């Protein structure tokens, strides 16, 4: 009969989870105490003894084969994969060497001090039974105070590897000792060790790849893949169990890590369902094992203790703490020299941040039960229970106090000001909406005292010298603007999460150190990982280019392509993100400070960084076309789909569409995105004719396309060639089809790329050229004579006229800076302003008889070229300019040498 | 050894779910076929027989105690509870009598035709083994075509009750037959029947209430309550099993229904996790039982079949179909007379909408195994398998064809036009965003052919006569406007989901029938349920007002309080939603149609409905104060919290606040909402002094409150008393503190309530009174003389002046109609316009020296009283008016008899 015991264990777990939250110590200790109470009752009353004599003394097989795999698999599921793989080498070598040192030193201490007849293998059992740690309570404590999530990942990963190594060592030593009939020669022992080393994780990886490939073919089905994932985990556990008695847990851990790594092939709802399911199973097993071990230790272990044996555990705790501190203190300089060093605070937290959790108690129970009626099992269980019940309270309380007294639990001043601003805004909004609602003719009867009191809110957080402070405050303002620009870019969907995290980390580490802005050296190092051996592998196999090896070649090809493609995508993303952010800062910081040389320094730094990054990115695009084409196509499709989804949501919110149909369209869009995620890694570049067909003002009609193709000429130029200088008429119109081109002319300097037309302005107004063109590489260009351009534009007079298209494009491309300079308050992005200008339409002066009247319907009005006269104010207007909202009567003259153009933005 | 069998069963279920979706017939048939194949292999190869001789021949106890409770409990969990409780009586009586008739007629048919030696009990066995249905495939087919969701609710509920009754009958007859040692006298048989009837569901309800009360005390913990819910279900299953062999399933069903009913005490994430968990378990059980019964029927049942036995199957199918049709055809007129009648389409669908699912196969397996080596078990299993394999294909295909040929697979024309409009808008948005993105200087290299092709979208759906068509189109336009107004009101958070469903149902049933609008009689019947018997029980137990009953009284009082409070809240919500929607519709169709008599009819109908509903709602508020106060306070708190959450989300979207802090504030707001949900059902009304302190222009300053209280007088009036007429100076200002008051004066007519001040306009401009005041009940009023009013207003000259407050309030209350009349395009609500006017501020003419200039910064400008002269246009402006955006220079004069006031709206 067991039912009452497990039911009571679940109830007590719920009670100790609910009622014991405000105390600093974890709930589990309370559970242990409860078990102790039951034990003494089980000693006296025979009925409680009869009801506990079934789970109290349970077979070692079920515990060692069930309670351990669940715990170790849970410790390897909630782990973030990318952060762990960032610093896997450091954490694994640290955990391995720490466990080795701890085991050997605990063994020699057991020989020296414990004055027993313990053998060598018993000493390593007693040493490696407490080296394993299960510090889920550390993560529970540092979920809020652990600002550096890298520290949380490190403290979880080191514990995970320590648990794995401790399980391996204990199992091999138990098999060598408690079943002495087995031979113990090295000849097959080395084979067994290498088998445990390699044959496990390889099998886990193979089955993980197989099951992910199988799951990648199921679309819109949240029921089959749950069953497939659970069966995939169980069968590998079974095979790993028959494989070796130890390799099962390692293979299961590798499977869990690989499943958690992939995200595209599994929908998020299934992922969170599996997370919750596994967490619930882990919690239930954890509660059961604490209560069972408490009952066992109180019932039998305590009656065979001695005063010296009671004194020994304090010395054991001091010894384990001092060796744990010494190993990390000694390895700190080596990891500093390698490049993955630490500091005072991280070393001190790691020194006092280890809690002996559930695995130690499980192994103590197993060895106590296998020992039988001997003093050795009682000593193991008593010592493990004492060490755990001591550390799980002392280290928790002192780690809380130490976090309080040191710099971890501090709040930055900008964060406090941001909280104050948000609280003020919320209070203002609540006040205005309450004031509005009190004026209603239907809700004037509610008792406003409790209505006001219940909805209140509160913040959870409650000269050379002048030049130095102003430059410091300007630097902090610039970094804050850069951070909010990155956040805005992320929200719009033009930038991936990982690139956002990298950029924010770079911004914070640049702001932390004195008077240093964002360094382009670290960024170019970040995307310089393209200079790596996988490319050498690809070159070797392409040079190479027994019967079944043929089909072996492309698949490897594919994964190699994949294995680099993401990397370039990431790099490219960062570059684009950075450059856009920089431009926005260069538009907003201008009117913030009024010290001339400070603006000069800021502008010089920003311009140099912009030019260097754009040059390096253009050269990288020149190096390889296919990956750039694939990344650009994926970005365009993602932006289009995101905007379409936003339009669906807005149209639903207006009530025009019911919720069923909006859900259907959203599901279709999500299916399109999922099919996008499975796109080929690289695509061959388009031919030049497609590039000619893809320009803005030669689309929608083949007549203009082949009319231009009738007389379009192709030219080629090499390095160091000057194509056009200043002080001359616009001979023709260029179009870059390959290479990279530098343009410089009178102060500003820029680098173009493929797909950008050169000198559109020079052919419309016949202005002299104002650009010097040089070539940084080989280049092919398309040349069209201006005479043919004018003949063609005089030939076509349809309503979608080519003249209108070019004037619209040049107007928007010359008017984005004008709006973004002065009218750009907080909350405006390049994308928003570009779309808002896109919604507008150009106006002609034929129907207006050279007279325009400014209404309040049109948002803004600008003049590109020409002169706009006034009558009541009589003011001259130059070109180009944004017309301020003062004059509402714009008259125009007629001039043969110039015809004015004007642009407006209207409402929807 | 079983592992390979269950693993293969799960894998085959996965395949048959994946690669068999385009076919119309359900996947389960395929599974059956697969089992058959394995069976014949198990007949020949001894190894497959050795691997399948374990699960195929399984002990009946585990099947009858595991596979049945899960299967029955799943159908009671995904059920919508409110739709089932709406029409529980009809469905339960129909299911019970249908099962009784089917069982008896199948028994007598087994007597007449089967020419066996079967007794009477075996006849009921064969009759009630196929009466049970598991039509989850019917719901799967009707999830998209069954627009009338009440049909799905009925077809699921009738199946559920049929399954329960069939289980009860089967179990009692099996216990009476296969264990003949048991006594079969009636004396304790009637006791057993009543025990199964009553003792089960009462215990289930008791434990459901206990576990919901326990779960209501846990806040922000998504792990304890999962374990508590699962343990609560299991312990009741265990106790119900020990209680009676039959009552366990009924108790578990009642527990599941009650758990699904409550929603406030359980967070939604836990709810969806339990949904997915139970669905997965049910699917696994279904796959296992199908494959096992296929193996069993192919291996042994088929070898003892005769040609006449093969011929009888068609006759049984025809007989069961005609019986199922005849019973519903005969019960149709009775349900029509009761008030829950049906029509042709529902009767025909119910006639051919029953599929014998997994429960029939389970019961056939149990009786076949208990029969042992006898022909009777083989005959049962063969007949059940044949009936299922026939109906599960024939009825599915014919129900699909019949739905296609009937009007249920039809699309309304307005839905088609809405889809066309949405598709056009999406295509336009995609085109404009692609055109904008092609002008970028960084994404000009992507091959636009695949980019354009991949993101494309397609719609899933591809004289008396003139007066008649015009009134029909006007009526449909009015109903469409009302529907979109209801949707907008629901989105803003001022109206509950259930009231929205009720109002939309009323709208569509009003639109279905010719030339009649929304009826106030049905709505008043909807909120007249407050007159339900409970109120009589409440009055009796208040009049009444052995040792432990003292604590029993208040709990009963409280549960009666809640049981009436929910209904009254629903009624009040429906009333307010309807009245706001009617005002908006009456404001928007001011210029849609241009027929005079049509406008007169529309206005008369709308005004009569508005007046009747507001009068009845005011009288209901007069009847009982406490529930009205509680509902109003809850509504105000909900609106305030929703607006605060919206401000959090907007502030996060602007990048000013990071994600963590926004999540923290959102969690705090959600906790506040959760604590709101546990508010007391009713609260006492505030004293009249609190009402005097709660007005708009006497808040935030105690000095004005006591100054008004110095000379405020109290007056009382009764029914039929006229307080003030027209043609007289404004003697004083009123304030309603109790009762209901009618005001009528020269055409318009209205009823006020408590908290609305009467005649504010008469004391500012000293205008003669234009209202006739009558009393529909007893009334108390607060009277203040105008002399004290003007003395007080001349006394106070602080910047938050009382004069400014009254002018602001009267301005917004007179200016809401002006904006809502002409400027209201699609997408504007009363709340939005009220907030937009609230953000504005009144302007004084002292600093403007009687001269104002209209900019484009201010959105709109209005004039309340006075004359606004012009100079360049020279136009006089009457009062009140909205100034059109033509004149931008507004000059003012000075007059002793009138001082003009002007209102503006500025940007943020
Ligand atoms: C997640 C979804 C849900 C469905 C599913 O996954 C997907 O869930 C999975 C999981 O839940 C599985 C079950 C888990 C538990 C399993 C238990 C297993 O039996 C146990 O198997 C153990 C194996 O070590 C022991 O058996 C002894 O092992 C010794 C070693 C031998 O020596 C000795 O012989 C064996 O057994 C000995 O000799 C006899 C044989 C007796 O068992 C005796 O006792 C025992 O001394 C133990 O003794 C025995 O009991 C049984 O064979 C299959 C089993 C039930 C599994 C069937 C398939 C599943 C349901 C899987 C299924 C797909
Ligand atoms: C959802 C969470 C997870 C944890 C939990 O719920 C919360 O899961 C619940 C559930 O999984 C429970 C288990 C379900 C299966 C149970 C099986 C049961 O043994 C079986 O009990 C049967 C009772 O009819 C039969 O025993 C016969 O009973 C009759 C006698 O006559 C005859 O002799 C016996 O033969 C059968 O013969 C025997 O085998 C055992 O006694 C307890 C048991 C294992 C349960 C222990 C407690 C649980 C684990 C519960 C636990 C709380
Ligand atoms: C809701 C209702 C659900 C009822 C299911 C559980 C209730 C009750 C379970 C009681 C089953 C009795 C069957 C008789 C066993 C027998 O004959 O003994 C055989 C031994 O075989 C076993 O002991 C097998 C037990 C497997 C049960 C696994 C269910 C897990 C569902 C997990 C669900 C967790 C949440 C609940 C040998 O002879």
What does this protein structure show overall?
Chains A, B: It is a multi-pass membrane protein. Chains A, B: A motif (Essential for sodium:proton exchange) lies at residues 162-163. Two copies of one chain form a homodimer. By secondary structure, chain A is mainly alpha-helical. Chain A is built from 33 helices and 13 strands. In chain A, strands 1-7-2-5 form a four-stranded antiparallel beta sheet. In chain A, strands 8-13-10-11 form a four-stranded antiparallel beta sheet, with helices on one face. In chain A, strands 4-3-6 form a three-stranded antiparallel beta sheet. In chain A, α13 packs across α16 (358-371) and α16 (358-371) packs antiparallel against α17. The complex binds Digitonin (2 copies) and ligand POV.
Key structural traits:
homodimer, mainly alpha, Na+/H+ antiporter like fold, four-stranded antiparallel beta sheet, 6% strand, elongated, binds the ligand CCCCCCCC/C=C\CCCCCCCC(=O)O[C@@H](COC(=O)CCCCCCCCCCCCCCC)COP(=O)([O-])OCC[N+](C)(C)C, membrane (chains A, B)
Number of domains of chain A: 5
The fold-level CATH name of the largest domain in chain A is Na+/H+ antiporter like fold
Strand order of the largest sheet of chain A: 1-7-2-5
Tally of strands of chain A: 13
Main beta-sheet annotation of chain A: 4 strands, antiparallel
* Quaternary structure of the protein: homodimer
Distance between the termini of chain A: 74 Å
Characterize the overall form of chain A: elongated
The CATH architecture of the largest domain in chain A can be given as Up-down Bundle
Ligand catalogue: Digitonin, the ligand CCCCCCCC/C=C\CCCCCCCC(=O)O[C@@H](COC(=O)CCCCCCCCCCCCCCC)COP(=O)([O-])OCC[N+](C)(C)C
Strand content of chain A: 5-15%
Gyration radius of chain A, in Å:
36 Å
Number of helices, where a helix is a run of at least 4 consecutive DSSP H or I residues of chain A: 33
Helicity of chain A, as a percent range: 55-70%
* Derived structural class of chain A: mainly alpha
CATH class of the largest domain in chain A, named Mainly Alpha
Largest interface: A-B, 119 and 120 residues
Transmembrane segments (chains A, B): 2-21, 27-44, 61-77, 88-113, 120-145, 149-174, 186-217, 222-244, 248-261, 269-302, 308-337, 344-371, 376-406
Subcellular location (chains A, B): Cell projection, Cilium, Flagellum membrane
GO biological process, one term (chains A, B): regulation of intracellular pH
Catalytic activity (chains A, B): Na(+)(in) + H(+)(out) = Na(+)(out) + H(+)(in)
